[PDB]
Amino acid sequence: SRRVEVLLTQLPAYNRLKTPYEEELIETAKKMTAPGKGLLAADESTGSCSKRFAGIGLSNTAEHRRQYRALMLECAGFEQYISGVILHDETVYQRASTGETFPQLLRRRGVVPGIKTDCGLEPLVEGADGEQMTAGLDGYVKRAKKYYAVGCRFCKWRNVYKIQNGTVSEAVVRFNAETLARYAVLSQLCGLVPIVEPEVMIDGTHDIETCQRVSQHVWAEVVSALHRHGVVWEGCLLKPNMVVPGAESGQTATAEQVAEYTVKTLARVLPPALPGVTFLSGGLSEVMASEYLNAMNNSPLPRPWKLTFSYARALQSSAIKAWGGKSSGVAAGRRAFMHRAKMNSLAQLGRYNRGDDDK
């Protein structure tokens, strides 16, 4: 019948985000998930850079951080294997030796520049002790629009979940999902493809079965919140943990088991309209991050989204050590970096060969 004339946007079925960047977001997500390519995660904080420079005894100055990023970004040829680079805010405004800003350099070489837009972990207050939320939604629209103006086309936001006593609190599952979903739609409104990172951390004594069950519970709520907030699924990406046994569990898992636990979990919760999954390496070794990603791209289970990488330490660890922070080590660093990029490129294609890798 008929009683009141309302806006379509006031009705629950019409909650989808209206953004003028929709077609551009979809194209960026396709570019970012190109076959045989993945993301380089170079978005470490200045503090986190002190832990990377510790082993090589390099002072944590803004210039040494620039040379650290320059070791990889001004390396020729990595566009064969890297589709996008997650930049830290500081690096977005720094310049390469070519005279361009790093966003300009990356777009000249067909690489999508992205920016980490979250403002770090804080205590959750609700839930259990040790659980953390992520700050940064205040003033987000102004920040994201400014990153877009200087050339960025995607962003990354990280929430963490601490498995304790085989479980996580329902407070952190509800709250962090709502944070990720709100972040996603604000990014798409400003023209950045949001990378939604709900990381079930590896720390703890839990086995791979506890991780599987917590990960599915956590990611399912993330997906539910994304529906509620009206995300554009085709212009969105997920950066999840791999389902692996806890770091201090004493248990071990083969690459095929990790692949089966991970892909079957994703297949239960992740809508196939989502273009790509860019796994974080977390607490895996360089070889293990290539080994596991390869196993997932040989899985018989359903996997309609692209399974690729968004690696930080798993792409730079050997490179930083060979670099030594010295200009004489640049050649060795880029040799190490490019080898890791090539291995993970093959792992995305399912043709990674462990014998062609480190021993």
Epitope: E74, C75, A76, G77, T98, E100, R109, A331, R334
Partner: nanobody, 136 residues
Framework: VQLQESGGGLVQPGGSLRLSCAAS????????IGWFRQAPGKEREGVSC????????????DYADSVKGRFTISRDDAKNTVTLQMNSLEPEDTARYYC??????????????????????????WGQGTQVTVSS
């Protein structure tokens, strides 16, 4: 990873050869490529470099003075090869010739073009070489 050089051999003075540089698992279109040579008992000298293709003015090239006018370097990104056409060779041109990749992003943002260097400081992935002997 390594490049594969071919085309060298034995020629009489005034003759010519055509050196080829091929790549297995690497796309050469992303690099500036340089040809080098080393004679027995001396250091490795730069012969010719070629930048990446600049749309649409082609690639930039450079040559060692002792070789300018006689050698010509070219690249075919489709066939993934770099060629060094050596003409009117003197016996002081005898050496084993190497191709290598410049691992530095050789871009000139002031002029908006890719360039190259014969220096060899930033070159890597040297092949095994190909011997070129010019003698009567």
């Amino acid at each position: 990873v390594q490049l594969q050089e071919s085309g060298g051999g034995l020629v009489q003075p005034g003759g010519s050869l055509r050196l080829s540089c091929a790549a297995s698992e690497t796309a050469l279109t992303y690099y500036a490529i340089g040809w080098f040579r080393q004679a027995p008992g001396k250091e490795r000298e730069g012969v010719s470099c070629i930048s990446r293709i600049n749309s649409g003015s082609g690639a930039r090239t450079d040559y060692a003075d002792s070789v300018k006018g006689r050698f010509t370097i070219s690249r075919d990104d489709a066939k993934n090869t770099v060629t060094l056409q050596m003409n009117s060779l003197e016996p002081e041109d005898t050496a084993r010739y190497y191709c290598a990749l410049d691992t530095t992003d050789r871009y000139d943002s002031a002029n908006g073009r890719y360039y190259c260097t014969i220096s060899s400081d930033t070159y890597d992935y040297w092949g095994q070489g190909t011997q070129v002997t010019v003698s009567s």
